[PDB]
């Protein structure tokens, strides 16, 4: 729940920190949901297809693979962000997901069952420079707006 | 009227512990409540209650060492003064809650055993006979972190703690944690003879009484043995469960 005071007028800054309230307003805030819908299920090795997925709250999201360990970052390319329109729905286009470059396309080459998730800007490494440049771990991934769904990759065909 | 939010009777975190606390104090301008360990440890804090005499104040920190800590709520009664204003280092009459913590500073440095400091606490201010001011007295245990799988059962009536499930039926799981019901989270895994995670859920909430429940479907499920999994960043529990194509009732 978050207020707001008002004050009587030609009252000073400094000197209402102490006064009380002349009336209030109060509103509730929630967390906002980022899911993902397209990188779900089934997945072809070195097949390219696009992100697709919803964030209520959200400016720049990033996507992350974990098998047995550290949420390695996929390097989607410019900017590794994806924007959100009015209707809280970003959408990139088709992606290889292993065909790109970096480390967390790797774990997604070998034929398995993984996992990936979604995650807004509140990263921002952590803590530091406004870009997303980590591998945040379960609990930097989970304490920060995120959600995640079960995928496993098929071998090719034909 | 005060309340302590205990998931098991304990805290798990030693390092960084969290109780929720809330209740009604009608009349009072603010409410101090303190821990104390078995050593004699203090830690205090102010709350701020609001008009209508509703404090709730939340995520509070204990700095004490792990053991067993008893708590006590503060709250001056008509005369506004601690008790009677005879505190034994500060000024007469002007004992205020602000004021007790001073004479609470000499507490901790003095080498008292913690059960000393219950019967100062008790004596000095509440015992008076003078004394208008009113406590509640509420204890727990502060332990170590804890997170574990009690029941895991189909949709039947069972709670002994282990029962094979058919395929295409969703079954329960019951554990037990500590931890915050929506700060935290727990992540569960099911992997078969060669792991090949099959599911993976997520809860973050339960209730005060520290069983959470999570719900996984067995509609492509196989037959044999599968492993379960859970872990919230700390200590993980493992557990293991037979998968049959129909039961035997």
């Known amino acids: 729940e978050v207020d707001l005071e008002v004050y009587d007028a030609g009252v000073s800054a400094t000197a209402a920190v102490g006064q009380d309230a002349t ?35 959200s400016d720049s999201v990033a996507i992350y693979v974990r098998d047995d360990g550290d949420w390695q970052l996929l390097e989607i390319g410019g900017d590794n962000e994806i924007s959100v329109d009015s209707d809280d729905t970003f959408e990139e ?58 995928i496993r990759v098929t071998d090719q065909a034909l | 009227t005060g309340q302590f939010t205990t998931i098991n009777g304990q805290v798990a975190p030693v390092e960084t512990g969290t109780v929720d606390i809330n209740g009604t104090a009608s009349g009072a301008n603010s409410v101090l409540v303190i821990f104390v360990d078995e050593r004699g440890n203090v830690n205090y804090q102010e709350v701020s209650v609001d008009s209508d005499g509703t404090y709730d104040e939340d995520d509070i920190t204990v700095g004490l060492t792990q053991g067993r800590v008893t708590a006590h709520i503060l709250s001056v009664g008509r005369d506004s003064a601690i008790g009677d204003g005879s505190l034994p280092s500060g000024p007469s009459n002007g004992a205020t809650l602000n004021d007790l913590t001073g004479y609470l500073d000499t507490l901790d440095q003095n080498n008292n055993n913690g059960e000393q400091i219950n019967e100062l606490i008790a004596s000095e201010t509440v015992d008076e006979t003078a004394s208008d001011d009113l406590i509640v007295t509420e204890t727990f245990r502060l332990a170590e972190s804890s997170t574990s799988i009690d029941s895991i059962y189909p949709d039947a009536a069972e709670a002994a703690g282990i029962n094979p499930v058919a395929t295409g039926e969703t079954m329960v799981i019951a554990g037990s944690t500590n931890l915050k019901p929506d700060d935290n989270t727990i992540s569960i895994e099911v ?40 872990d919230d960043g700390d200590n993980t529990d493992t557990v293991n469960v037979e998968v049959v194509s129909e039961r035997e009732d």
């Open chain 1, 23 to 57: 009336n209030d307003i109060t509103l509730t805030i929630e967390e906002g949901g980022t899911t993902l819908s397209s990188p779900t299920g089934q997945y072809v090795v070195g097949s390219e297809v696009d992100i697709n997925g919803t964030a209520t709250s």
């Open chain 1, 93 to 150: 286009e088709d992606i290889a997901l292993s065909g790109l470059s970096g480390d967390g396309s790797s774990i997604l080459s070998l034929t398995g069952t993984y996992r990936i998730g979604v995650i807004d800007a509140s990263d921002a490494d952590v803590g530091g420079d406004g870009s997303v440049d980590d591998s945040l771990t379960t609990s930097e991934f989970t304490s920060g707006v995120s959600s995640s769904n079960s």
């Open chain 2, 191 to 230: 992997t078969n003879e060669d792991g090949t995670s099959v599911a993976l859920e997520d809860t973050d909430e339960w209730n005060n009484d520290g069983q959470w429940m999570v719900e996984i479907d067995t509609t492509d499920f196989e037959t044999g043995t599968f492993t379960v999994e859970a």
